[PDB]
Amino acid sequence: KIFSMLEKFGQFHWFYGISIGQFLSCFKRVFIKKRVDEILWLLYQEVYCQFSTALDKKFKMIMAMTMFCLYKFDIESEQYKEAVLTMIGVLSESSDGVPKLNDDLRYLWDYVTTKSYISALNWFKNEFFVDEWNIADVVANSENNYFTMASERDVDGTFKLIELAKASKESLKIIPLGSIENLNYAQEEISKSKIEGGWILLQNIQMSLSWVKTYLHKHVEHEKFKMFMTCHLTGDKLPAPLLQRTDRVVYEDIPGILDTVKDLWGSQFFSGVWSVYCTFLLSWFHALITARTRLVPHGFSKKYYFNDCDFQFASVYLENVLATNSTNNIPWAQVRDHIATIVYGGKIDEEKDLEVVAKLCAHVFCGSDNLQIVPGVRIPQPLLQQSEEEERARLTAILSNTIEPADSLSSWLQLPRESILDYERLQAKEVASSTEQLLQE
Amino acid sequence: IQVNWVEVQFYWLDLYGILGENPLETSKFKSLTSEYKMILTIDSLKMIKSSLSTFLERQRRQFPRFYFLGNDDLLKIIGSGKHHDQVSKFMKKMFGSIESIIITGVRSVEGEVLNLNEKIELKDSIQAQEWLNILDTEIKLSVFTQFRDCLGQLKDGTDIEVVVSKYIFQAILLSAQVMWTELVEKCLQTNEFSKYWKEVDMKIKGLLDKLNKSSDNVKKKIEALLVEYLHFNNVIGQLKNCSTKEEARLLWAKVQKFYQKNDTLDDLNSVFISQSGYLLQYKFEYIGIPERLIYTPLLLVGFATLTDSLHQKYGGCFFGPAGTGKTETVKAFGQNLGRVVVVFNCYQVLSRLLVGITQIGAWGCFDEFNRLDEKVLSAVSANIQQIQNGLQVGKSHITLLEEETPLSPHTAVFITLNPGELPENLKKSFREFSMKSPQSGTIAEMILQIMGFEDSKSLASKIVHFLELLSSKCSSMNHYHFGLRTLKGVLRNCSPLVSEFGEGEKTVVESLKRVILPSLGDTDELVFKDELSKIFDSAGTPLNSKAIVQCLKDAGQRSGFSMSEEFLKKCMQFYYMQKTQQALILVGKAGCGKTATWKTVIDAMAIFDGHANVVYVIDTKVLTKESLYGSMLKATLEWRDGLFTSILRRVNDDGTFKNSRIWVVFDSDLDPEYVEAMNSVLDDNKILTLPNGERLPIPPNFRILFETDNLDHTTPATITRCGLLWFSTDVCSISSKIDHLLNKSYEAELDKLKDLISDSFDMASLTNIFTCSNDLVHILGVRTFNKLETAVQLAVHLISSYRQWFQNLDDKSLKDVITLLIKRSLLYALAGDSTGESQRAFIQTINTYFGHDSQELSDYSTIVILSFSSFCSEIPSVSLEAH
Ligand SMILES: Nc1ncnc2c1ncn2[C@@H]1O[C@H](COP(=O)(O)OP(=O)(O)OP(=O)(O)O)[C@@H](O)[C@H]1O
Ligand SMILES: Nc1ncnc2c1ncn2[C@@H]1O[C@H](COP(=O)(O)OP(=O)(O)O)[C@@H](O)[C@H]1O
Ligand SMILES: [Mg+2]
Ligand SMILES: [Mg+2]
């Protein structure tokens, strides 16, 4: 039954397919680690632990809730099954009615009644499943040699891989692709690493899929040697024999707005005091618009991708504005229009999204004496007799002092709570609908 | 082997002119020429030419502009090193917008002439690359000195009408741009704008008055300069209405500004263009007098995003719905900076042109980058990614296409897309922009302002509201293009009508009728008429065309065609629509009357003008591509003449064809392959590009027609380029077609016989007969309108067979014989394509509707020699043997 569920998962996306031998090795892991009911429970925990990391967040919750449903339908009584299907139906807005009543059930009813969809979806993972595997756990407990990492756009696992390098004492050779010289360098470095060793990394094989499907299937126990491959979930389909021969892992984006501000601010090394202030405001605006992007049905109309190239373009534009102005009268309207229309609004085809970006630019780049960019913190204007090192010191201090509240998706992004609850309702509805479709057959 | 010997001789002479007259390949060529002089040597010469690519590549590297032409054409040009021919007539493909050389001058495609600073001596000893480089440098420095003395005259204080009639369009254009920028900056140092606004308004009025009375080329120049002068007026008017100085500074920084460096020792790099703080160097390349785009605010936004992309050496990507003007935006950006953007209408030729434009330094736009196959798309994406990676890192040289080639610092690559997308490698180094629908109101308003209409803003608003009402209310046909292209077509066709209808709403209404009404159905025509009554105040007063109508009626009477109201309407539409458009497309159902319509129009024009008419009915699909145009035989480098090329050569060489109107009718389906090779004549160029490179001119009276039945495989570009006339309903009645068929069958007691036959075809019973016949089940379903051509002809020929026994019988028996033959022909033509039981049912219907007084046609009845009998007496019993 669990393998049929995983086959149904693989029938949806090209990255979620599962082989029979993988499931049999996952079952062998139960007896390797250190009565029939305990073996069954360990099987459920081990399958979830080893096959959550190959799926994204929505399919993580779908798999967890379906596997909990299967185990509890086998173990518990009929009234338990009817109650759980009632809660799934009211989450999916398909069936209505109070459960016919257990601390877990009343906790879950308290979660559902107060309209907390995230808590209702995470209750299964919080209650039943114990262990969760990060990138280090899946790379350490793998006998495989080639690792394929997939993620959405505007997020990269390369920083996590360098963190693992600093943790596992290894050196990565990042190999960008896209040019024939880079292809020859990649082939030379793979030939070097397959003989000597060392962790070898490949970035974004999506545009080099031709070289991949002409080289890597034919190319596919060295010590301290693991090959990491990075692709994109939304890109073109990878070859099936290549996919079956590698340990597929999906890396997930951060939820922190202020963490994105820190990440953008720590990578800007220097161009006077006003350039530093403008770069700080640009980092905050980039983090705010990137955070607002991910709320696809409500924050925007479609899915856009404001990468670091847009930040580089806007930074060069701010540098050119600050350089060619000797009166220190910053043209705030000019930079607002050029950022909302040319830099960030260029790829936007809709009109409402352009209005959203224009409103965000008017709120962030207003250039007032006391700017409250979020409901939490206010950024004062710089003084004309301060060094750039002092300016960076006070900007770092005001970044470290402030904290991110629980409702940062509403207050910081300037969104009503109704939109957030409606988005969470849509997420829970599609998760529960997919679970019901899995559970009927 | 005569053709092989001729080809070998031609190859030997060409290569001797290329290299022999002025090492291993040279020795092999010398040995092969010695063997040919002693005497299948063609493959050896082809392999020698293939091995001579390194010398060919060095020749192409000597002067970069020679690279554009093909290998055969370049070999032909470099082989003619003494005659100084074929290089001036084919440098349009190299220089993009310059047609011929006058050295004392050059001629662009539009006909503008450039006067060089000084003459260049031409001699037979000078090779192609040296004098070509001298000509290029002299052209650029002549453009710079025209710039210089234009600013000398303008800063002197002279009038603009004296300098608009002297120098080329680029010089006066950029002189006006720089002068306007200086005045706007000087008046931005203060808060006074009305004086220079009034001055440029008076300049606009003076250029309009000079436009009214000058020649055609000068008229084109004044139009292309009034576009920018109206833009200057718009910018100054916007800056005048600004409340604060900050808003004025914002508006001035948004628009495109021009400056000149007065301190650099260099000349061609003394101009930088400022837009939102970024700088670009003007190139001083020649473009001619092209169709200047109307500077809408979205055009300035497109210029701003292309400037922002090119400041950091990123490519420019545009995407959006088709028809929003992205290709023209890129071209206008290129020609605003005085350079020609090379257009690749989307592997060997593509990457060849790509390395050519990255070696020359000219900008290249990949228009419609959504139609290539996956492998070539990915590989050219890798090529452009390599080019952009070289440009961003400032590499002096690039290893592109497995050769080491220099990288020009001014090379840029642009992409336009038509979704309804850019690959990852390209998107890592390109800037995507999504331009919206263009301001049709502003474009139409400015076009009307140049054209001299006293009411421009309200009239343009009414026109765009009318077109949007038709796009929202009419049916969703595949050929209903109501975008900006057809609006510009309406405005362009408003130009010949003003000489008789005047600058006003009436000309717009009449041209709107003439180029919108033909391409609509029936309910669409009703909607068009109602909306034209509602929006435009003019009711569409009739014009004076009684002479043409009478000529049409005389043509119909002498050709047998009757004149219904709808046939008259279609003929008048076709005539008024062929008065302006060169190549026309006639569409409609099968057998609806297209050929009759245009034949009647031709006869009417022949009577009205007294002018000779030549018709070449050439079906498109009956000739192959080689037979219709021409085939270059690769066996011996020979040429074969196609039919259309042969008749163009015959009409060009000619004294009969110099005083005649010659018409080519393509009376079959529209093939995309047969028309994409014809695209060179459909536009205003009117020049046919043969596969061998021959350019045959087409006279203005050489009017092309088309005649098909469907448009599902016709490109929308050819739909807009050619005129489309739609036959929604038949141009005939049943009685009129019957009368014409009778008349042509008579032409192909006689008067009494004709009168009796015509009186026997009573329309009252015939309409019911045809209505009953249309309800039956017919195999290979053909309309009754296309069965009348047999139903009349069969009866006419049967009576023509029985005419010689018609002088020895009574009148009633003659009427019975005529009626029986008519009933038999009606049976075997209308219901003659159905079952026997249905044929018998049609006999019962015929006997019911033609009355019992007439002779009752039986199921097996006939006429034997005359007496009435059946076929049962005509059956011979056959005694067959065993084997
Ligand atoms: N004014 C008219 N009065 C009477 N009959 C007419 C008139 N105009 C056309 N017809 C008839 O229409 C018939 C249709 O033939 P025609 O040559 O016009 O077809 P067409 O337009 O070439 O059709 P297709 O190419 O689709 O076969 C003619 O045979 C002619 O008898
Ligand atoms: N700003 C403008 N001024 C004048 N004409 C314009 C302008 N923008 C677009 N057009 C007209 O719109 C027409 C359609 O452009 P088109 O070639 O279809 O663009 P694309 O190929 O990118 O869709 C062109 O013939 C052009 O003359
Ligand atoms: Mg285009
Ligand atoms: Mg025809």
Curated annotation (Swiss-Prot), chain A:
Highest taxon, organism lineage: Eukaryota
Region spans: AAA 6: 121-320
Localization of this protein: Cytoplasm, Cytoskeleton
Domain notes: Dynein heavy chains probably consist of an N-terminal stem (which binds cargo and interacts with other dynein components), and the head or motor domain. The motor contains six tandemly-linked AAA domains in the head, which form a ring. A stalk-like structure (formed by two of the coiled coil domains) protrudes between AAA 4 and AAA 5 and terminates in a microtubule-binding site. A seventh domain may also contribute to this ring; it is not clear whether the N-terminus or the C-terminus forms this extra domain.
Described purpose of this protein according to its UniProt entry: Cytoplasmic dynein acts as a motor for the intracellular retrograde motility of vesicles and organelles along microtubules. Dynein has ATPase activity; the force-producing power stroke is thought to occur on release of ADP. Required to maintain uniform nuclear distribution in hyphae. May play an important role in the proper orientation of the mitotic spindle into the budding daughter cell yeast. Probably required for normal progression of the cell cycle.
Miscellaneous note of the record: Present with 195 molecules/cell in log phase SD medium.
Family, per entry: Belongs to the dynein heavy chain family.
Subunit structure: The dynein complex consists of at least two heavy chains and a number of intermediate and light chains. Interacts with DYN3.
Protein name listed in UniProt: Dynein heavy chain, cytoplasmic
Organism: Saccharomyces cerevisiae (strain ATCC 204508 / S288c) (Baker's yeast)
Taxonomic placement: Eukaryota, Fungi, Dikarya, Ascomycota, Saccharomycotina
Gene: DYN1
